[PDB]
Design a protein around this nucleic acid. Structure first.
Ligand SMILES: [Mg+2]
Lengths: 594, 597
DNA sequence: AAAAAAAAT
DNA sequence: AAAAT
């Protein structure tokens, strides 16, 4: 009733993550907690008992573990900062479940003149939350368009996710229930502190931003391209924000087509609040544009030498020009980054050469900061040496900088990349363990389904019987979620209005628990007035009658002046008073004795 | 008081706009309305009665003229800046918001830094134009050149569109949360949910530069002081543009470039700022910072118009800048042809009247006027500098042909609006040409203060007297403003809940106004429920008695299931809001009828 | 050199 | 298994 999500969507979401090969779940930070999941813990996820009582009831949006998010900076391919947000494993499923419901009820506007792919696939019998299957199919079609058509146009959007209007995204889904779209958009915006976050690899946000949000824009490009008579045929292929425009035309019309198509892209992008990446956009280009023999171990030695002699103050431009180009073989068709990844993932024994392992040791001990140019590949290169003195040396060099206080964001990314590749080893964690450190201790060492059932609160009535009405309340769970949603954005007016409703209803629940109100269902409406609140709270024998009248009278003075239904400090002070009462009214209920 | 804005803040906002020179007022779209304002209209804007009865009461947020915003694309490297055109009253309010913030905000940055924005709040130099601050900014850049050794330039990409308006107003500690709600929601209403770009507005320029960037700017100041290789440093800022002047030894330049640049990238990411990489240059020596007919002549302009006419319209901005704009450059002066072209159209107006020059300009506007899109503002001035009727009217006729044929695109709109602004909205051109055009008719043609009072709704009671309680209702006005704010964002649940509250209070006023309800104040509380609300609408005898029952029944059905107060879709909610809106239109029309019943 | 103004954002 | 946005 509150979330229109069906169990089939949550099931689909859980199945896409489970379908990821176990040898792939533990290569990423965000998918590692699912790698530690037992088979019995999986069965609980797809079980409808866990869905209707914890997911659909909104109970999961009432625990601080599911409303807490963390910052994590990852490295861009060419040396930029991609700021991401880390969410709890439960929230990671919910984002995919939302996309599962949207895929069922959204009617696409783009025609079959264009193929679309994202970091996932809802294709039947091939559901997966990973990018390999979709990206491989994406690159296979780019080759098909490479042979069929003559020229291609490539465009891209800058800061795509951060410029997405989350409210506008959910508004273009007609058959989406507005009461449910309010819950979805609030959670997503809460992850991004008001804007569309970057949950790296999350197919939920990938599908929503590529298939739904870009639908209107892609449709106008398709329709306008048909009016151009100079184009014989065309085909569009898109991966998230990357777009390829293959066409068939005469060479004599290439100039006018470049003028027509580029102005068509700019006009429509500005129309839909999209910013075209001028750097990553090229004009109409012709479609044409033993491994130990192409790249030997000597070519790898020159890489470490040019890198070990390069100063640590060199930017990415100096690293990519000298060091990375050393790997490119004239006869081979690959960049310096692609060849480097092929060595660490296939020629793993090369790091055990006497010369290579020694040149590697010089890198880690001289300055580990040189690892920042390719953190994933270079750390794998270090770990491929299989030498404990080097592996423990890189960790201790990181530990010394974190011990002093000079640890910036570069020391962080190297540390997190190191801890993920070593599978969050217990000995490494005992030496390191703030912010992201809390998520590592919380979900990266245990089964979060087993820890979910242990840390569950339980209320006991006067007859020492379990009270299950609070957690199953589809009104209390969502009013509390909205009160926390506005609190994270520091919007104290709307946050007080919602929490005051949660306060009156939770008080009405503690009455049915102690047997004071002995009706069919709890009397929620009775405690909306001031006279019934301070009288019932005093009847609970858990607070002083002088303080109770001091808090609710002040809180009533705020509700009668709240323009949502007096400084931020005054509102936050009365809200903190309402929270302390709840924390004591809660601890009073779990005590079966008296 | 639903906004804590003071009269001094509004007075300041109107003064800095008035302080703009007239010959600069008539140069921009947003400020041209004020160029037509009579002196009595200026007196009214500063008058105490106008502020308390129209601004601080929220009455201005209940007229469609102040809640209607239109898109407009201005020219950048040949990119698109999507702007949002606001009403003249709204243009002042954003500036008045900045005035209250300037009085109560405490800057965290120190005097190691100099911050400028598009305007000024200086004691004796209040101005809403950018020429004053930009000249002071250019002067400080020259002083910093003569004293420091190297400078580091930085810039933010999509700076305005990446700002979080809610977080911005949250760094203003002394701003009350209730006024911050109105200020934030109105700004987000203009930008359709995000921070907009109102062309040249000092109010948004001040907030995003002085307040939003404060946390980032102080972090750089504190971190630069810890670098022992930096002897001294001074920081200069203009909106998002930033210069880091330092004094140091040449031997530490490599370490300082790596230290300063990475610190910039780290803290910018921390505050959700996207650093522009194309405009960020490393530590460059200060010496590299940027009689007329002796260098540039009429022949230089003849060579410019020649290559422009030989270049095909299919050419892009790079081919224009490299092949055409280069002919204006001189190998003795460091200057882009853009700055040279601006000097010719603005200081050599008579050059466009030369015989040879005027013929190639006519050839430029008769072959394909879409070649003007490369330098829309400058090349239009070049055409208007010819003072030729057949040439200037020829450009208007070609634009009218592409608009009558229905084949006009965004490029033709940019040339058309810039042409209409540069020709000062000529009467003959307006009759030939005519959403953005509606703003032209409503504001760019006459005194908008005089038109404001001639189009004010007047409500008559049953005794044929004026009913003045609706306009002065601070509660009704702001509730209506929130309903139209959520409606603009297409958020049906919040828009219905606020409009229903506005609907209940408006009917309560119509009940007192028509004499059905007696006493001192209208009985607002009695019309909050289904039953009494239907009876009051039946009593007025202006709608079908059955349709009132169906509309209110469905309206209260939606209210009882609204989670912000299933089977309720977006369409169903929007239909009930429309029926509620339709009833108000009939109720309002009936109220401005003196001799009725 | 002046529709003492446009050109920066 | 990693190497994509
Ligand atoms: Mg609300």
């Amino acid at each position: 009733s509150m979330i229109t999500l069906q169990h089939q969507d949550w099931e689909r979401a859980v199945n896409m993550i489970k379908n990821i090969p176990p040898s792939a779940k533990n290569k990423y930070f965000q998918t590692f907690p699912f790698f530690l999941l037992s088979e019995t813990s999986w069965e609980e996820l797809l079980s409808e008992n866990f869905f209707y009582s914890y997911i659909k009831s909104g109970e999961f949006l009432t625990y601080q573990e599911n409303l807490s998010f963390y910052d994590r900076t990852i490295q861009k391919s060419h040396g930029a900062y991609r700021q991401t947000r880390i969410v709890s494993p439960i929230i990671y499923i919910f984002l995919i479940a939302i996309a599962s419901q949207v895929e069922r009820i959204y009617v696409e506007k783009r025609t079959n003149d264009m193929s679309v792919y994202f970091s996932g696939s809802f294709e039947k019998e091939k559901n997966t939350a990973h990018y390999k299957q979709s990206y491989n199919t994406y690159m296979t079609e780019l080759n098909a368009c490479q042979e069929e058509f003559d020229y291609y146009f490539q465009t891209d959007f800058s800061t795509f996710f951060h410029l997405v209007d989350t409210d506008n995204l959910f508004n273009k889904i007609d058959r989406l229930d507005p009461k449910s779209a309010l819950v979805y958009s609030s959670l997503i915006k809460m992850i991004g502190q008001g804007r569309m976050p970057i949950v790296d690899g999350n197919s939920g946000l990938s599908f929503l931003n590529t298939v739904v949000y870009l639908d209107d824009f892609d449709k106008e490009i398709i329709d306008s391209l048909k009016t151009i008579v100079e184009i014989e045929s065309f085909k569009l292929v898109r991966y998230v924000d990357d777009l390829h425009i293959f066409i068939k035309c005469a060479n004599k019309d290439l100039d006018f087509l470049n003028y027509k198509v580029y102005n068509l892209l700019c006009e429509k992008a500005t129309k839909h609040h999209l910013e075209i990446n001028s750097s990553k956009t090229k004009s109409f280009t012709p479609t044409s544009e033993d491994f130990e023999q192409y790249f030997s171990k000597n070519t790898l030695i020159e890489f470490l030498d040019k890198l070990n002699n390069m100063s640590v103050n060199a930017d990415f431009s100096e690293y990519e020009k000298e060091v990375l180009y050393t790997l490119e073989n004239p006869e081979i068709v690959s960049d310096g980054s692609y060849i480097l990844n092929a060595i660490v993932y296939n020629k793993s024994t090369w790091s055990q050469d006497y010369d290579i392992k020694n040149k590697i040791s010089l890198l880690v001990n001289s300055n580990y900061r040189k690892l920042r140019y390719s953190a994933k590949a270079l750390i794998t290169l270090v770990l491929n040496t299989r030498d404990g003195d080097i592996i423990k040396g890189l960790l201790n060099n990181l530990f010394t900088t974190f011990k002093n206080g000079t640890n910036d964001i570069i020391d962080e990314i190297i540390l997190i990349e190191y801890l993920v590749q070593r599978k969050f080893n217990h000995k490494d964690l005992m030496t390191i363990l703030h912010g992201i450190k809390e998520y590592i201790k919380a979900y990266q060492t245990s089964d979060f389904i087993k820890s979910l059932e242990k840390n569950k609160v339980i209320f006991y009535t006067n007859q020492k019987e379990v009270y299950p009405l609070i957690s199953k309340d589809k009104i209390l769970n969502f009013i509390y979620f909205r009160a926390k949603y506005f609190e994270s954005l520091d919007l104290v007016l709307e946050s007080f209005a919602y929490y005051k409703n949660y306060f009156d209803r939770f008080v009405a629940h503690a009455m049915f628990c102690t047997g004071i109100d002995s009706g069919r269902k709890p009397n929620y409406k009775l405690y909306y007035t001031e006279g019934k609140l301070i009288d019932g709270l005093k009847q609970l024998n858990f607070l002083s009658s002088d303080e109770i009248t001091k808090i609710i009278n002040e809180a009533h003075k705020i509700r009668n002046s709240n323009p949502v239904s007096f400084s931020r400090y005054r509102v936050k002070s009365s809200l903190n008073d309402l929270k302390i009462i709840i924390e004591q009214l809660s601890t009073l209920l779990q005590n079966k004795n008296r």
